[PDB]
Amino acid sequence: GIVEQCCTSICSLYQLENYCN
Amino acid sequence: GIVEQCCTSICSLYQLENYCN
Amino acid sequence: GIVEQCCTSICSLYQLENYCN
Amino acid sequence: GIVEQCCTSICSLYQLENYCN
Amino acid sequence: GIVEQCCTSICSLYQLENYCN
Amino acid sequence: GIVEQCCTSICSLYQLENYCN
Amino acid sequence: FVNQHLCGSHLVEALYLVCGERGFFYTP
Amino acid sequence: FVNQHLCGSHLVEALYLVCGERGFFYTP
Amino acid sequence: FVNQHLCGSHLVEALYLVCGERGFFYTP
Amino acid sequence: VNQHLCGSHLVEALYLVCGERGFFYTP
Amino acid sequence: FVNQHLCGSHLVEALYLVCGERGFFYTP
Amino acid sequence: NQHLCGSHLVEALYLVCGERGFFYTP
Ligand SMILES: [Cl-]
Ligand SMILES: [Cl-]
Ligand SMILES: [Zn+2]
Ligand SMILES: [Zn+2]
């Protein structure tokens, strides 16, 4: 999920965008 | 500057990107 | 929405709880 | 104190309210 | 108080420091 | 840089001020 | 003005905190 | 985990900016 | 002590919301 | 609301500025 | 103006996120 | 850890530097 991908490793905007509605 | 353009109207990610180094 | 209700007047904790899952 | 109680384990808002004056 | 002094005109580092313990 | 100096140990205000342009 | 945008930004911070493990839905 | 907790706060903040009118569904 | 410093920043934010008109005393 | 939002930035500012002293927040 | 000040605070945050490894120049 | 810390750094620099501002490089 978002924690695994973005809290242990840095997420770009592009990566964050995957979790939008 | 960034304040007149983005504090008077909301700036998109694209508009914000112009002020990147 | 939440902006209409909570950006014109401060919303209480109860009012904020409305948008919890 | 609050650092000891709340910076390794998450304190709920209800728990946090204990530190209001 | 701090809201009256600092929410219409910007308070400096020095002015903010006045409200420290 | 600033991450090396201030994300391993806390930097004081004056130390942070070193990175003002 | 960008008041509503600035406000919404603080709103998601408050909802994050109020909602705990439940989380929340965010739609303008 | 408080470090996870701090991170999520920055996540919803970021999603708020990125997703725009799409919004998002935050769920731990 | 960076973790305690980052945590403290989110703690006061949290206290700001929860305490409302009571306010709060913050001390390291 | 604006006053509330301003206060949110003030307490963050005091957290940084006051350091080990800390501060007393009253609305 | 405190409204510009609060807005600017959110701008550097957005730029921090948006600009990434490039980083950015801030000047009022 | 570094990305989160850096976010607070930029907030801190925004306050401390005042009218001078700053240049952010990772
Ligand atoms: Cl953090
Ligand atoms: Cl604001
Ligand atoms: Zn943080
Ligand atoms: Zn704000």
Swiss-Prot record, chains G, H, I, K:
Stated consequence of mutating residue 10 to D: In HPRI; Providence
Top-level taxonomic group: Eukaryota
Protein name listed in UniProt: Insulin B chain
Species in which this protein is naturally found: Homo sapiens
Part of the whole protein covered: 25 to 52 of 110
